[PDB]
Amino acid sequence: DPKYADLPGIARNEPDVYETSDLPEELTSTSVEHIIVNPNAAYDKFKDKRVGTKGLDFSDRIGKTKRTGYESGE
């Protein structure tokens, strides 16, 4: 205020701002069956399931016939 009050080439009794007025489907298909995912229930179903990781090797090794990973959940 005192800064531009001293100066001659200053806008006085003029508006500062010139501005404009302030202005203020597939998941619902019939064909597909819709499943609701409940992870709490899914955990309970798979909770006590186990796998046999002894002798496990998925790799493309030819030696020693065919292999099947995860023997049993004993």
Partner 1 sequence: IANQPVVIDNGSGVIKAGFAGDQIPKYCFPNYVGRPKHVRVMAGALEGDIFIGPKAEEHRGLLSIRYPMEHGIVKDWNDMERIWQYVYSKDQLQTFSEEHPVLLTEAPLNPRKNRERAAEVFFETFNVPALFISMQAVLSLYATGRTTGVVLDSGDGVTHAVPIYEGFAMPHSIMRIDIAGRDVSRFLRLYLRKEGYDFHSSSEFEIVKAIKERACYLSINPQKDETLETEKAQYYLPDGSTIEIGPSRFRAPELLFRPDLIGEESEGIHEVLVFAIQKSDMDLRRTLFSNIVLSGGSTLFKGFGDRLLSEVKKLAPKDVKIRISAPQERLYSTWIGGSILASLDTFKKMWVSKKEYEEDGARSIHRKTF
The residues that touch partner 1, with contacts defined as CB under 8 A, are 3-4, 6-7, 9-12, 14-20, 22-23, 25-27, 29, 31-39, 41-43, 45-47, 49-51, 53, 56-59, 69, 73
Distance from the first to the final alpha carbon of the chain:
85
| Complex with partner 1: residue 46 or 65, whichever CB lies closer | 46
Q: Shortest approach of partner 1 to residue 69 CB, angstroms?
A: 7
| Cβ burial, residue 45 (10 Å; 0-12/13-18/19+) | exposed
Inter-residue contact 38 to 17 (CB < 8 Å): no
Q: Shortest approach of partner 1 to residue 44 CB, angstroms?
A: 9
